[PDB]
Amino acid sequence: MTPESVMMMGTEAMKVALALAAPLLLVALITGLIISILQAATQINEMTLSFIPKIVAVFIAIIVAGPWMLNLLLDYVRTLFSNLPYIIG
């Protein structure tokens, strides 16, 4: 195949990767930033207190959105292996 086809395939690949990661990364970032802003405003000098809520938030994300990130990825993979006999050439 041409390099451009490889670039397009990688493009849909990292698009799916970003769609998978953002539901989790965004909530983790929001929780960390909120806790850090509260800490700076209250002068409670301790970094490790930001770690405990984040996990819960991350876990919350999964239990609220685990199905979707499970399904969409499959809808990609089942396509990719089905496009295998048509990318060669």
Partner: protein, 208 residues
């Protein structure tokens, strides 16, 4: 012109000697085997399916894929020879044509040109007259390239999974947690859910 019986059986046994080479360099065994090895490497499980299991699967898939070619060879070449209708030389010449057509169907013109120019062959009119000594290496090279293409494409979803789990672990501050231990079960789950084995074998068969 017909070879005597002792010469015929000498040729038959000597040809039976070359069976693995024919399987590897004339059939679809090599591409399936390469893709299976790359897939096994891609799941992070370097020795989960034993080599014998994958070799047997590749052999059965090759037999199924090459069943039309074998049927053509039987109907056109082997059957008249077994009924003494044609000699061994002409039977072999007639049996070469379907296999040659199958190999030409799955070769790349650039590799054929490379081997023709390297062997100093004269201009050849159409695909009808291309020597087997020219077609075999070109077909092997094309099979290698196609197998690597398929394996590299297959490597993508597991790369996505590894990257997303590594990023999720890193954004939590977990600096010294390796992502392979968490990624391997999820790679297995992904391959199971998409019905990976039958889908990949169907894709390999459809590409031929």
């Amino acid at each position: 012109q017909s070879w005597s019986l002792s010469v015929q059986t000498l040729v038959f046994i000597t040809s039976l000697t070359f069976l693995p080479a024919i399987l590897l360099m004339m059939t679809s065994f090599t591409r399936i085997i390469i893709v299976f090895g790359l897939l096994r490497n891609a799941l992070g499980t370097p020795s989960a399916p034993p080599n014998q299991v994958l070799l047997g699967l590749a052999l059965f898939l090759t037999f199924f894929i090459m069943s039309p070619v074998i049927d053509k060879i039987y109907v056109d070449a082997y059957q008249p020879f077994s009924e003494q209708k044609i000699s061994m030389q002409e039977a072999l010449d007639k049996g070469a044509q379907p296999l040659r057509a199958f190999m030409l169907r799955q070769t790349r013109e650039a590799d054929l040109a490379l081997f023709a120019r390297l062997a100093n062959s004269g201009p050849l009119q159409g695909p009808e007259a291309v020597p087997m000594r020219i077609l075999l290496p070109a077909y092997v090279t094309s099979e290698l390239k196609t197998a690597f293409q398929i394996g590299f494409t297959i490597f993508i979803p597991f790369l996505i999974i590894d990257l997303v789990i590594a990023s999720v672990l890193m954004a939590l501050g977990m600096m010294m947690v390796p992502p392979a231990t968490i990624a391997l079960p999820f790679k297995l789950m992904l391959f199971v859910l998409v019905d990976g084995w039958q889908l990949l074998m169907g894709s390999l068969a459809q590409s031929f």
